Write a protein that binds this ligand. Structure first.
Ligand code: SAH
Ligand code: SAH
Ligand code: GUN
Ligand code: GUN
Length: 613
């Protein structure tokens, strides 16, 4: 709604800014701490800034909403040599185009969102087993042998029983069909038996594009014309496969493994031949259910037969395949050890298939300019347990990133807050701006604050949350992190992190940029200073900070003694940007008196906490 970034530019760039429409802030070395706070608070949109910032720390500037823009690689702060957030190209300078400049900021700004989400997700991989609302981004960074990845991803085009097709979706080009094949099927299997591997160029391109999951897999590759492979995890068989026996002998049963069976067999007047090969791969796989978690079989659609049968779980289109390529892939979910619970996918069984509807699929989804989003969706569908986060009761520590306040969850605040009470890390959208390429509804900030904060649950806005993690987990979230503080501030974040001790007033907790303007805006619009501070912060709907920690910092810490309290700030490795019980309860009473029903509990909860503690 109101959070803004300070778009800071270096000197060589400063002149272009002056001729724009956003406001301009000229510093000037000194600037005391309080100067910045009262100056920055005057601005209600994003603002440009230039001049000397070198005596300020990164976290101080981030608490202000600073984004660093320059032609140069970095800027010298008081703390670190900070990597430039937005690097303005030479040609962009220079032609002095104010529009191209701003579009440069904006594009790089959209790219920085990933940095914000990734920092939160990395903390979550360190602290959680369960992941809800997941998609390819989570799978990609997950240890499939430890993490459990759940979600409700957009289901791809499939075929069973049954039938549905389309509807059609817009799509983009991707990798060549056969490496794309490995792309969506390879995720949790430790061992792959690949029959009909060919010349291995396909496998070697997978190694090149995906070093990680290639290396973690043991590859048994079968083909009479297969060349040598000096890769230690590629065991090469020049055997022609006609029975399960050819595969059983290259297995170690005395050790537990998830195995995947991949069949791409084809040969050199008709091709009832091609049919008996596809059927064979399926049959071999079915016989070997119990040893294999899953199978992917080559599936060419016959020309003569209008209907026919096969052994399948799903049949789907192939990403990167040609428009005229009348071939699908047969996914078979089997029994056999697996790091992913795929029980929701029906056991592979005998399936009737009408050529015509399987003919449409090709025509709807294939094409050398299609496949990118198909590939994504196949990947997510095969490898994520379909579960509704709000309805799932868990035994393991869980993470709940970027899904709660998706529009599909509208009007389900109770169960949303129920997640935020127990999640290790959860996010909720609170942004009120009107607010593009993002389809979430906003939770009222004051409600979040009042419901979210517990002894064990830390509740902060996105930027606060990051600054907290910078401070508490220095190599989970580095100081040098490129991210957009305004963006971060569209989210509330809850953390399973104990109140700090001493309960110091760190930036993560206390920024309150714009508070003075907000009190005036409250008074000229809806009228009724430590008590006024609380009443304004809540009533403004502009802030998300942690009440529990804040109440702890106010009473237990602050008086105190100026000297012996910084000291406990030093020490705490904490910084700031600013240098009673009956007052706080007066604020809360005034707040609930201005709005009952629409809140609050909770409120009474904090009220009956302050008058006891
Ligand atoms: N109530 C709910 N339960 C389970 N999944 C949900 C959900 N509401 C939305 N989702 C799903 O969550 C996904 C949001 S994309 C979020 C990606 C991921 N959590 C991350 O860290 O970036 C979408 O696939 C959406 O379908
Ligand atoms: N019974 C069988 N067992 C293993 N491979 C077989 C086979 N019958 C035919 N083949 C092999 O199957 C291959 C099909 S070419 C398949 C393309 C290959 N997977 C690639 O990506 O390059 C042929 O090279 C042929 O040698
Ligand atoms: N900040 C942010 N990061 C992401 N990474 C993946 N998705 C998102 C998102 O929606 N927001
Ligand atoms: N198949 C596949 N699709 C993706 N889309 C985004 N990441 C991936 C991936 O790792 N594999």
């Amino acid at each position: 709604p109101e959070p803004h970034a300070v778009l800071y530019v270096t000197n060589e760039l400063s002149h272009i800014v002056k001729d724009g429409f956003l406001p301009i802030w000229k510093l000037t070395g000194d600037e005391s701490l309080n100067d910045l706070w009262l100056e920055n608070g005057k601005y209600a949109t994003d603002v440009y800034a230039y001049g000397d910032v070198s005596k300020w720390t990164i976290r101080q500037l981030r608490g202000h909403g600073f984004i660093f823009i320059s032609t140069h690689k970095n800027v010298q702060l008081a703390d670190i040599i900070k990597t430039v957030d937005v690097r303005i190209p030479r040609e962009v300078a220079r032609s002095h185009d104010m529009k191209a400049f701003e579009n440069e900021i904006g594009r790089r700004r959209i790219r920085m969102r990933k940095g914000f989400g990734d920092a939160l997700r990395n903390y979550a991989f360190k602290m959680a087993i369960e992941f809800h609302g997941s998609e390819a981004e989570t799978l990609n960074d997950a240890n499939p042998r430890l993490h459990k990845i759940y979600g409700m991803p957009e289901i791809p085009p499939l075929y069973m029983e049954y039938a549905e097709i389309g509807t059609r979706f817009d799509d983009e080009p991707t990798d060549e069909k056969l490496v794309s094949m490995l792309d969506y099927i390879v995720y949790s299997a430790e061992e792959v038996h690949y029959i009909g591997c060919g010349d291995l160029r396909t496998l070697m391109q997978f190694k090149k594009r995906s070093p990680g999951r290639f290396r973690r897999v043991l590859w048994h590759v079968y083909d009479p014309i297969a060349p040598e492979c000096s890769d230690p995890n590629v065991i090469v068989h020049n055997i022609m496969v006609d029975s399960k026996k050819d595969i059983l002998k290259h297995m170690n049963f005395l050790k537990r493994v998830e195995r995947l069976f991949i069949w791409d067999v084809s040969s050199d007047e008709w091709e009832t031949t091609r049919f008996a090969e596809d059927r064979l791969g399926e049959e071999i796989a079915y016989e070997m259910g119990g040893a294999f978690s899953s199978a992917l079989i080559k599936h060419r659609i016959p020309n003569s037969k209008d209907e026919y049968h096969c052994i399948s779980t799903y049949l789907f289109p192939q990403p990167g395949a040609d428009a005229d390529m009348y071939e699908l892939r047969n996914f078979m979910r089997l029994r056999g050890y697996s790091h992913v619970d795929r029980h929701m996918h029906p056991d592979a069984s005998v399936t009737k298939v009408v050529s015509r509807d399987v003919r449409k699929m090709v025509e709807l989804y294939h094409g050398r300019d299609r496949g990118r989003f198909l590939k994504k969706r196949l990947f997510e569908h095969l490898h994520i347990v379909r579960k509704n986060g709000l309805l799932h009761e868990s035994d393991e520590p869980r993470a709940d990133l970027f899904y709660l306040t998706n529009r599909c969850n509208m009007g389900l605040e109770p169960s949303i807050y129920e997640v935020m009470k127990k999640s290790v890390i959860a996010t909720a959208w609170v942004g009120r701006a009107p607010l593009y390429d993002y389809d979430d509804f906003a939770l009222p900030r004051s409600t979040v604050m009042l419901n979210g904060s517990y002894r064990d649950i830390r509740i902060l806005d996105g930027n606060g949350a990051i600054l907290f993690l910078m401070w508490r987990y220095p190599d989970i979230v580095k100081k040098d992190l490129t991210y957009d503080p305004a963006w971060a501030m569209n989210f509330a974040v809850s953390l399973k992190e104990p109140i700090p001790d001493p309960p110091v007033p760190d930036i993560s907790l206390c920024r309150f940029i714009g508070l003075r303007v907000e009190s005036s805006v409250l008074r000229v619009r809806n009228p009724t200073d430590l008590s006024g501070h609380l009443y304004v912060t809540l009533m403004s709907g502009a802030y998300v900070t942690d009440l529990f920690w804040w109440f702890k910092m106010i009473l237990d810490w602050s008086a105190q003694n100026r000297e012996q309290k910084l000291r406990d700030l030093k020490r705490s490795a904490a910084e700031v940007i600013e240098w009673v019980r009956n007052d706080l309860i007066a604020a809360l009473r005034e707040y609930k008196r201005k709005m009952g029903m629409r809140e609050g509990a909770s409120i009474d909860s904090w009220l009956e906490l302050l008058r006891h503690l």
